[PDB]
Amino acid sequence: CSALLDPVLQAPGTGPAQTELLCCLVKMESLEPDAQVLMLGQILELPWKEETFLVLQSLLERQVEMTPEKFSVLMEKLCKTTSMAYAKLMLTVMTKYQANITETQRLGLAMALEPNTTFLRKSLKAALKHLG
Amino acid sequence: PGLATRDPVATFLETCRELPPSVASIKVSA
Numbered sequence: 001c002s003a004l005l006d007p008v009l010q011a012p013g014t015g016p017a018q019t020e021l022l023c024c025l026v027k028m029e030s031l032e033p034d035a036q037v038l039m040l041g042q043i044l045e046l047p048w049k050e051e052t053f054l055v056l057q058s059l060l061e062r063q064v065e066m067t068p069e070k071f072s073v074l075m076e077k078l079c080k081t082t083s084m085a086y087a088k089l090m091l092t093v094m095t096k097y098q099a100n101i102t103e104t105q106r107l108g109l110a111m112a113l114e115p116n117t118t119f120l121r122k123s124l125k126a127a128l129k130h131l132g
Numbered sequence: 133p134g135l136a137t138r139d140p141v142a143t144f145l146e147t148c149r150e151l152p153p154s155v156a157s158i159k160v161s162a
Contacts, residue, residue, distance in 0.1 A: 107151065111151070111152065
């Protein structure tokens with residue numbers, strides 16, 4: 001995946017076909033825990049777009065472990081934005097890794113959440129309330 | 133330079149005891 005992921009997604013016209021393969025890659029029951037962490041750790045350094053979010057959604061559906069610095073970088077990139085899969089991403093973090101979420105992360109969340117170009121605005125507001 | 137600290141005392145006090153953008157606009161006739 002160090003060979004495959006980076007270039008495929010740095011590539012333009014990275015179509016839905018390829019995202020679905022990478023989605024099935026991260027859905028691999030055989031993708032072992034430390035493997036999932038290195039997948040994540042590698043995803044972090046990239047230019048994040050719609051495809052990056054779509055992948056990462058399925059990646060963290062596994063409820064995979066995050067170090068605090070790594071969750072920090074996550075929420076940092078996550079702060080920056082109308083995308084609906086990106087809405088799914090923010091929702092999934094807020095729901096699951098609330099165990100990991102703090103107030104300033106919740107604030108940067110609020111900043112990125114303010115948009116109405118978003119969908120599920122309400123749901124996110126309720127989740128954000130529940131974090132507080 | 134895109135076209136070419138903090139208060140000691142108020143900090144000291146804290147140490148001794150133990151986001152959005154603003155906006156402004158106008159409109160004028162041509």
